[PDB]
Structure 1
């Protein structure tokens, strides 16, 4: 059970809802309702239709805290040193000087 999205409006399409158009090239277009489906048939461009996800993305609308910071990182520092060479003497020959 996938929930698809509207290839025009960017809306979730829950099962058995809206219509599915298979174009000549075999490109499949899914619509949630007859609004997108007609606006699509009219050769409307979603980026010009103010209530569209696509329109909103391009106009930077309401996103906010997805542009705010976060914390994801690590701190590691582990010692392997090398294969076929005794790793015993790899920390004895590494005390550094400076």
Structure 2
């Protein structure tokens, strides 16, 4: 088994969950639930969405 990280957020995945997507340019993305997909597909940058890891690292939230 391998764990993988979501592509919109940076949360973890265990191997029973999720979906995977392969845009026809020759790239793949992992997603964890319908919430995150719809965000990705609707062309939203995760650095505003304040429940994600990237936001928390950019605004130095925590520490």
Map of 1:68 onto structure 2? none
Structure with the bigger RCO (C-alpha within 8 Å, sep 6+) is 2
Map of 1:55 onto structure 2? 55
Provide the aligned length of Structure 1 versus Structure 2: 63
| TM-score (normalised: structure 1) | 0.61
| TM-score (normalised: structure 2) | 0.91
Gaps of 5+ in 1: 65-98
Gaps of 5+ in 2: none
Structure number with higher strand proportion: 2
Larger radius of gyration: 1
Map of 1:18 onto structure 2? 18
Q: CA shift at 1:16, angstroms?
A: 2.4
